[PDB]
Design a protein around this nucleic acid. Structure first.
Lengths: 174, 302, 246, 302
DNA sequence: GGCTTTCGTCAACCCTTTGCTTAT
């Protein structure tokens, strides 16, 4: 029922995004969809308030059926019709909340440019899946959201085992 | 004029403590500084969990980190630095017609009393916490720049007037009110006993091997720098029905005791700050509290 | 002529290890480049390139879980919630010892640079840390290519990172090439229109995400060059080494 | 209706032994202390397992850690210090309106008898466990501050009345019922015999080659501080159908026997603690039990 | 007319367990 769960999504709230600051601070609610990085293995993300939604009577909500087997690229190209295309594209919009968000200066070469780094959704879910399935073990684990992972995103709500971060420890002398 | 707050008003940490470093020395010869080794101890006890009485005939096996003095040395040496920076009324995020008018509303606090209760917690030894209990003698050596200060017996609860805490307090207050750094190389000695247990900061982790993980730097025991900072800012005796000093927080809260002493009674940091910017007559204590939080810092979202 | 001022054994105490949402550990080259540019703003000495290192570094925590820093109740209108604990957002901390090298055009004496640096390092934080005790700064010069490498050898007991280049992405090049990522820059997604709640208001504001490069921690005396280990800003907001990819 | 325990609540340890170091001396020459070193013994045994009767003609070779007195020394000296820390009802975690209405509840508890059973368990020598069996005569000395008390032969399970244990009991219960600390540097002499088998606490080892790994700091035979502290708090003679003193666990738990003596009979720590908070008075021997657990410490709320 | 407290809603994992280099 991937047409029903879209009118669901949009009604509850619905913000598909491939970049957010909810992975940094859960008090954030800033969501941007980048048009230029959607690739064949790009894992897209979504958010509704309290991560609300209905399943597909097989146990999976919108997020896992949209992450499974490039279904987001399938709809985004238009292989499942143009009536799902405009719904998915009107789902992906913009949101701006620099609150709770790190703000650093970066040079433009002849001046400065105040820059807010937010997390990547494809990088997080794709890194968890790949560094679990090729068994990379020099790494960390971070559960985003705390004891209620339905707050941050939908990826948070589903992957409650914890997102994987690279262990960036350098060598120590002596 | 309703000088309403910015979205996030962010102040830097003006006390800048470092991690304490736990060493084992003797009381007489305080020069063979050997590191306090964090060890790995596996225990056998019993379950003893609330409402689980049908598992109480079983045991629990818990691997814990332990840090003890070696049984040739009888004094725990705690070494950290405390860097009092003063740029107190300068904001990282925000600041204009809210931080400047707070600066010209907080310009007449007793910075000497704030620096006094700041230095006293480093001098009475509140940075040791459970290292301070059971010690026969807690002699602390504070080395401000080319000026060695020593303290050996201070009541940690009551800020009794000393003549050498106040001398450090003058230069720390002059830096806090003005600019610069008056960094406190601080040396703690506790006559605990031969082979007594020392108590480093425990890491809030999710360790599968260990049930209690102690903070270790290279393997040597250590205490957290924010733990030391929480000890230094434990100055607040200006809340309702004050008994003991607590850490200055935006709501005067300790999450360990499960009670907030400065919330729900219009005495929180944001209410007093809002009164200060729109124009009120703050008393000396709740003005000292607001500038103590400004030295503490923190994002003031809302 | 290259004037390399090297500080050693910088015990930074409280480094927030979250360089990105997938990288936790050593602070990136953007951190040290920002520290060099902070020294350029605060004091005035124009640093065009910066190196760093790792005498010691431990991200505090377990093997796969960092230490969860407790959060203070710091928010307006959150006074009824302050009796319980506070919700904690991910912020790992790390405690390590750094060596650092700067490339500065000072064209002046060397006993006044050291101090236009010791009066900054005592008031600066290396990625949110607290600089506990650093060895005395010493200025060294480089005339030829081997004089420079009498400085690489001078920031010793340490592991300077070298840019090793991203092949296809970072996850493919981490398990095939035994290597680790690091934020080498940021990519501008959108433009922030609400400058009322920003750091400066006037500087143009962009939303961004990290872009990463992979790095290798070669001991500095085992590196053939040192221009391959001297990070500097680039064009499309990308910090890079002058010697490029190792 | 009822005042409940906080979900975060814990008490700190108030009897803090050091890890005992176990030395070899003679009975007459007690000041020639050599170190009983833990060595490794590989033993040829016989396979005798309750399930397998077919592999019973084979014999297992298990390497164990042993500890013996040297053959020129006939007395095991067990040296440790016991730190009795005060502020018993001052909870480390929590402490809001449940650790304070229980301090006033256990305000008339018999701290003197609790301290007598503690220092009696250090003075009869119950903190030696298996080290006491087959000893011709026991002699413990407890050197409290600028004093020295010697107890040769005391009954173990019977808390008999003698005046020097009462003196150390009074000076400990002037700390347990109040504030501060008191330390007991305890030395345990057992005339075991020349070359006799010495029993340390053996470590918890998982997947190790040794079938028995004894505790050691730098090679010396040693007993765990928790093993001493368990035997100090073996004071509970107030459980249902009491015949022997057990350790004051919250459920009266003995993991050796595999039964909890205070679970199910509504005489555990949590039900009596909730009753003491919610109005209901306790027996003197039950008040002793709950404040003995507060001396012991633990997560007392969930 | 916001506004600030408190209670009511909405959930559901699969985990792995040292080297990164390795000194002028």
């Amino acid at each position: 029922m991937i047409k029903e769960m879209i009118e669901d999504f949009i009604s509850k709230g619905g913000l598909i995004f491939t970049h957010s600051g909810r992975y940094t601070n859960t008090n954030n609610s800033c969501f941007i969809f980048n048009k230029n990085d959607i690739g064949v293995d790009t894992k897209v993300d979504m958010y509704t308030p309290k991560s609300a939604g209905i399943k597909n009577e097989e146990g999976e909500n919108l997020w896992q059926v949209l992450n499974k087997a490039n279904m987001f690229y399938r709809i985004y190209s238009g292989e499942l019709g143009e009536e799902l295309q405009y719904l998915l594209k009107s789902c992906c919009t913009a949101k701006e909340d620099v609150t709770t968000l790190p703000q650093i200066y970066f040079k433009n070469g002849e001046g400065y440019d105040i820059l807010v780094p937010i997390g990547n959704a494809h990088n997080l879910i794709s890194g968890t899946e790949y560094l679990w399935e090729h068994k990379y073990y020099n790494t960390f684990t971070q559960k985003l959201g705390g004891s209620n992972p339905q707050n941050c995103t939908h990826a948070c709500n589903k992957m409650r085992g914890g997102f994987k971060q690279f262990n960036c420890t350098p060598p120590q002398v002596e | 004029t309703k000088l309403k707050a910015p979205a996030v008003l962010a102040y830097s940490r003006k006390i800048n403590p470092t991690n304490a470093l736990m060493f084992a020395v003797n009381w007489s010869d305080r020069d063979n500084t050997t590191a306090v080794m964090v060890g790995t101890k596996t225990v056998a006890g019993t379950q003893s969990v609330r409402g689980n009485p049908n598992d109480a005939d079983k045991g629990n096996i818990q691997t814990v980190n332990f840090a003890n003095l070696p049984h040739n040395k009888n004094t725990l040496l705690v070494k950290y630095n405390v860097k009092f920076v003063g740029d107190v009324f300068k904001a990282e995020l925000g600041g204009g017609e809210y931080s400047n008018t707070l600066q010209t509303a907080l310009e007449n606090t007793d910075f000497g009393t704030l620096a006094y209760r700041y230095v006293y917690n480093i001098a009475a030894g509140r940075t040791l916490w459970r290292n301070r209990v059971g010690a026969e003698s807690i002699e602390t050596v504070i080395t401000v720049n080319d000026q060695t200060f020593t303290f050996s017996d201070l009541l940690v609860n009551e800020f009794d007037e000393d003549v050498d805490v106040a001398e450090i307090a003058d230069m720390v207050a002059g830096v806090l009110s003005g600019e610069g750094f008056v960094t406190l190389k601080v040396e703690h000695y506790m006559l605990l006993g031969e082979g007594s247990e020392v108590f480093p900061s425990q890491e809030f982790v999710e360790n599968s091997k260990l049930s209690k993980q102690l903070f270790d730097l290279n393997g040597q025991a250590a205490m957290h720098d924010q733990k030391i900072g929480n000890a230094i800012r434990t100055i607040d005796t200006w809340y309702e029905d004050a008994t003991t000093p607590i850490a200055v927080e935006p709501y005067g809260s300790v999450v360990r005791n499960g009670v907030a002493y400065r919330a729900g009674n219009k005495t929180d940091l944001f209410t007093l700050m809002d009164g200060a910017v729109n124009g009120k007559s703050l008393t000396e204590e709740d003005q000292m509290f607001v500038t103590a939080n400004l030295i503490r810092g923190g994002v003031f979202g809302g | 002529m290259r004037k390399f001022i090297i500080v050693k054994n910088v015990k930074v105490d409280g480094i927030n290890a979250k360089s990105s949402d997938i990288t936790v550990g050593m602070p990136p080259a953007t951190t040290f480049c920002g520290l060099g540019e902070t020294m350029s703003i605060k004091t005035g000495i124009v640093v065009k390139a910066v190196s760093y290192g790792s005498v010691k570094f431990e991200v505090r925590g377990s093997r796969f879980n960092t230490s969860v820093t407790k959060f203070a109740w710091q928010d307006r209108g959150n006074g009824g919630k302050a009796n319980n604990n506070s919700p904690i957002q991910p912020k790992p901390l790390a405690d390590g010892v750094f060596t650092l090298c700067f490339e500065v055009e000072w064209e002046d004496c060397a006993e006044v640079l050291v101090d236009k640096v010791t009066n900054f390092i005592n008031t600066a934080r290396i990625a949110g840390g607290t600089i506990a005790s650093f060895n005395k700064p010493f200025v060294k010069v480089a005339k030829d290519a081997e004089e420079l490498a009498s400085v690489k050898n001078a920031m010793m007991p340490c592991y300077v990172v070298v840019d090793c280049g991203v092949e296809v992405n970072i996850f493919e090049d981490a398990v095939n090439r035994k290597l680790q990522p690091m934020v080498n820059g940021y990519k501008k997604l959108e433009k922030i229109v609400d400058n009322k709640h920003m750091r400066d208001k006037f500087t143009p504001a962009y939303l961004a995400t990290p872009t990463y490069t992979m790095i290798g921690y070669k001991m500095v005396s085992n590196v053939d060059n040192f221009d391959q280990a001297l990070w500097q800003y680039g064009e499309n907001t990308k910090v890079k080494t002058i010697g490029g990819i190792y």
